[PDB]
Write a structure and sequence with these properties.
Chain A: It comes from Homo sapiens. The structure is a homodimer. With 97 residues, chain A is mainly alpha-helical. Helix content of chain A is 96%, strand content 0%.
């Protein structure tokens, strides 16, 4: 009798849809939870490697400044040594008629 | 000689490259993840719809059959009433 068989067919499809929809749902929750853990792990590694780079950038900044001062000090030392050398040469040349 | 600018410069370059390569690879992974999850979501959306349409098909058939059974009960109850009435007249 078709009332009975249609009732059975309906129940069987409802059970399939309901079991399916629970799987889609549990699958989405598991995926979200896995992405969350992985994104948190990444943010820890990001924060740490930025700190390490930022410390080396500070040192590099200090060193670029030191090098610039060294060039400045050397230039002035060279200027003063060159003018003394020149004066001695001018005195010698003059002293040789 | 221990901590020159050249050494620091190389160290900062090396660190920047590792950080950028990491951020890139992980960016690709996030995009691939979203692409796959979008694809699955659209696939299930379709399978869902066709399962729902199948169910609704039989639900409508079942609905008609419940209606037809209710009709049959009504007709049978009426026929039984009329037959018992005629019969009753012969029972005296």
């Amino acid at each position: 009798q078709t009332g009975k068989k249609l009732m059975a067919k309906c129940r069987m499809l409802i059970q399939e849809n309901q079991e399916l929809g629970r799987q889609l749902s549990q699958g989405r929750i598991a995926q979200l939870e896995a992405e969350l853990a992985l994104q948190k792990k990444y943010s820890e590694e990001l924060k740490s490697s930025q700190d390490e780079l930022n410390d080396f950038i500070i040192q590099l900044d200090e060193e670029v400044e030191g090098m610039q001062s060294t060039i400045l000090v050397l230039q002035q030392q060279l200027k003063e040594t060159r003018q003394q050398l020149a004066q001695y040469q001018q005195l010698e040349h003059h002293h040789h008629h």
